[PDB]
């Protein structure tokens, strides 16, 4: 049974796209793979932010993942900084990573533009820590979005390079190739995917938005001039309408041919009304689960404590072999 | 509580008399006056590719060399860097408070880049930040280092002040402790070049574990100025070889530079190199007798490492917990 590792940023404002795409897909596969979810608070601090907000967002992310169906009995979920092995292997893998490999990262060069005032060593060194995150757990599979592909490739390079010197210490991870299938596009830019990182929040529906705000953003979702207004799937002529159908279908399960006949003789106004109802209905159940988890501090502590302990048994095993291989004197027990 | 001293050396190569005069001598001298913590920085060592068996042996060699020099485990915390996870942990956190430019301007990074151009790795680049972590973890007041670590030490003051300015007095701002004499021991055949463990010309280098007979031969061959007449006078700029030899003899006898200048009045360089030779030969001979007694007792080495890591961890965890609270990490449930 393959080991899967995902990093969860304790700062991402997750959208319905995240939830009905990757998250829903992985929630349904917790018994097929040994899934590990790691809230990467050590990665987060490469971008400076309020300390209290980072603490709060670490817990928000924990409760949100739980509300989405991550089951801490089936999967391992934990906070990165709670397992010191991440930093430890992070340092040691620096010594097997070329400076040039890090310099050629587009994530570093792109994030240098956005944060030209904090081009800090953490921003530069992020891929090595990522590499350590993955390799500690003998990970077979990493779901990555497009802008993490090069980071995963470095991880595979580091694993192979390290193995070539010392033996099969790490598993070489593979990208998880199949995509969720749900199509959720930006509400004003329906050629671009709805993204949690959009600075234009009116493109997205965040997982915690209330129904009044959902209607606001859906009602302003772009449509087509087509006279008469016809609810028909056409990603090039009627993308906006096609996006609303795709989102509704992702919410309800109804097929696109079913939805077309559902809205036969209906206007663009009612289609948005049905989308908002379906989306807010979905978000209302997620939200009540979120707040039940989120307000239960003892529960969240127990999850964090149990997850870190599960992660640690694997992480320390790998780090022990790493340190033995590199040549350190073992810590006297 | 006494003010805290922290310093480290790599279990790489063979420690030199430069390592002794720039760092190790002051470490011994400070053990009573301050609370001293001394580290074998094996995680720093691996920034230069090392044979794994040699690295493990070098760690034990270095520890026995500390003990031979007079570092006393009942006065000083002595410990191996990789035995205290908090060094790696604070290293990462402080990465996020260090500017890329501060690391690319590092003289040591550039020098090691040219020398290990086949292994210009991120550890070599990130080196100063882990060093910063090594120091700041212990609320360190003083860092006894040679002159070549000054830039590294100054970055760690910058990092500490930068972090404190955001978060309160989490760290002490450390101060360098760099000796007036012997901060930059020079190469015997090229006294304009610092004496370096990695020198391929071994006639430049006095090894602390090297055969005293070979050391005497190298010191007798040390190059000296062409002053006419020869005069044994301390002048590091114009009389580099002679002054370096005066520093070295000073480090063995404890006589001041002016007492040695008065002692060598009417004496020439041949007599000088002879005295330095006999003095260093005596010191290394006694050093190596203590070295082997410590080094051949691996169970003692193991006990020192365990006691030291445990003493170090108590202090490092206390600092790391405060760092984690300040930057906003959820604390690990206990
Ligand atoms: N020719 C010389 N003359 C005088 N002093 C010299 C000479 N060559 C070396 N030194 C000093 O010896 C110490 C050990 O050298 P390292 O190369 O191990 O030094 C190094 O590699 C450090 N980065 C180890 C370290 C890691 N973390 C620390 C924290 C505090 C202090 C030191 C450290 C050093 O003090 C060095 O300045
Ligand atoms: O930015 C992101 O989402 C990445 C954050 C991250 C840190 N460590 C890992 C390991 C696997 C996958 C990811 C990460 S995804």
Author numbering:
A (entry chain A): 3 to 335
B (entry chain B): 2 to 335
What does the paper say about this structure?
Chuangxinmycin (CXM) is a promising antimicrobial compound targeting bacterial tryptophanyl-tRNA synthetase (TrpRS), an essential enzyme in protein synthesis. TrpRS catalyzes the ligation of Trp to its cognate tRNA, forming tryptophanyl-tRNA (Trp-tRNA), which is required for the accurate translation of genetic codes into proteins. Importantly, bacterial TrpRS exhibits significant structural and functional differences compared to its mammalian counterpart, making it an attractive target for the development of selective antibiotics. Structurally, CXM is a tryptophan (Trp) mimic but is characterized by a unique dihydrothiopyran heterocycle, which distinguishes it from other known antibiotics and contributes to its distinct physicochemical properties.
To investigate the tolerance of the TrpRS pocket, two analogues of CXM, 3-demethylchuangxinmycin (dCXM) and 3-methylchuangxinmycin (mCXM), were tested. The complex structures of these analogues with EcTrpRS and SaTrpRS were solved. All analogue complexes are isomorphous with the corresponding CXM complexes (ESI†), and the binding modes are nearly identical (ESI†). Consistent with its more flexible conformation and reduced hydrophobic surface area, dCXM demonstrates significantly lower inhibitory activity compared to CXM.
